[PDB]
């Protein structure tokens, strides 16, 4: 799920020193550069998040005219992170009156569909497309995570709660599951057939995680990241490819295992000879931070400790509230992200 364009409120407006034709508009946890006086604190507008893809339109989107590209056969512009003169800028914020069809909408409305906004994605890897057996199981949740920048009242409304903190690895999402008399291996969106060349199935056979699911004899989905060579530029500099667990979905109960439930099941697989790796786990965090402070934490060492990580994922210990914080330094170094 993704709310790419929503009606949001201008927060603090701060001057960009040195170039007085523009200023910095805070929008929830984002900072977005605007033409001076275009907005004012409390004004409403449509905010388009980074990774939005906006189709070419020089009457409504003239500020994007020079960034138009061909993506999936369609001409338009990918919104990405920018650093204008030491000023971080992410997203596009346009005043409500450029949108007459939105005059009956309320603050917080998702206007992605009505405005025709779609999501930009990096290209999928070599052997991670594979051969499609069927849909992603409707009885398993996908692994998307909301960004801290969109969770200001929730971060405030989680002060004092404890979180599992893990490193986000930059690969492809992978799900391996048992449902009664079916074991399946999926990518981010499709379930795949086993072939000699499919990467996710190899990773599943390599670490015996299918045998682990048969030992546990439970309807579970093991969810994690497949990383390594020819996957997303192989930031970790691994040789070969491997699965790293970060979540276990309880299919019958339709809920994720808590961090300590997951850690116990991983230990049980471990001493039974099932060698399923887990994403790096850092120290638990007792939350008492702003989104800006969380974002500051996101930069740091990855699984390979000599490289800079994509970011962090935060999972409340009861398993009921999770979010991610992507390193803005990572976004600046990797323009294809």
From TrEMBL:
ATP 3 binds at residues 119, 143, 145, 166-169, 188, 225, 315, 324. Mn(2+) 2 binds at residue 121. Keywords: ATP-binding, Metal-binding, Nucleotide-binding. Signal peptide: none annotated. One of its GO terms (molecular function) is ATP binding. Mn(2+) 3 binds at residue 144. This is Predicted protein. It comes from Naegleria gruberi (Amoeba).
């Amino acid at each position: 799920v993704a709310k790419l364009a929503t009606i949001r409120t201008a927060g603090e407006i701060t001057p960009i020193a040195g170039a007085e034709a523009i200023e910095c508009c805070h929008v929830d946890g984002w900072t977005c550069v605007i033409k001076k006086g275009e907005f004012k604190q409390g004004d409403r507008g449509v905010y388009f998040e980074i990774d939005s893809f906006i189709k070419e339109d020089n009457d409504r989107y003239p500020m994007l005219s020079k960034q138009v590209i061909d993506y999936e056969g369609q001409r338009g512009t990918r919104l990405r992170t920018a650093r204008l003169r030491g000023q971080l800028s992410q997203g596009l914020f346009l005043p409500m009156d450029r949108f007459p069809e939105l005059a009956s909408n309320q603050v917080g409305d998702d206007v992605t569909e009505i405005l025709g906004i779609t999501a930009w994605e990096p290209p999928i890897s070599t052997n991670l497309s594979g051969e499609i057996l069927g849909e992603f199981p409707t009885f398993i949740s996908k692994t998307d995570q909301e960004r801290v920048q969109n969770l200001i009242p929730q971060i405030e409304e989680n002060k004092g709660q404890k979180f599992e903190v893990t490193v986000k690895l930059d690969g492809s999402s992978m799900t391996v599951y048992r449902k009664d008399d079916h074991i399946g291996v999926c990518g981010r969106n499709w379930e795949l057939r086993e072939t000699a060349t499919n990467a996710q199935w190899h990773a599943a056979r390599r670490n015996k995680m299918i045998e682990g699911l048969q030992f546990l004899n439970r309807n579970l989905a093991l969810q994690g990241e497949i990383i390594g060579e020819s996957i997303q530029g192989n930031l970790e500099k691994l040789k070969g490819q491997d699965f790293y667990l970060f979540d276990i979905y309880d299919i019958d109960k339709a809920q994720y295992l808590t961090p300590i439930e997951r850690q116990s099941l991983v230990k049980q697989l471990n001493d039974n000879g099932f060698t399923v790796k887990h994403v790096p786990i850092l120290d638990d965090l007792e939350l008492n931070h702003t989104a800006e402070q969380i974002l500051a934490m996101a930069d740091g060492p990855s699984l390979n400790k000599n490289v800079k990580r994509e970011g962090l994922v935060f999972k409340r210990l009861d398993g009921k509230f999770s979010f991610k914080a992507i390193s803005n330094a990572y976004l600046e170094k990797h323009k294809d992200r």
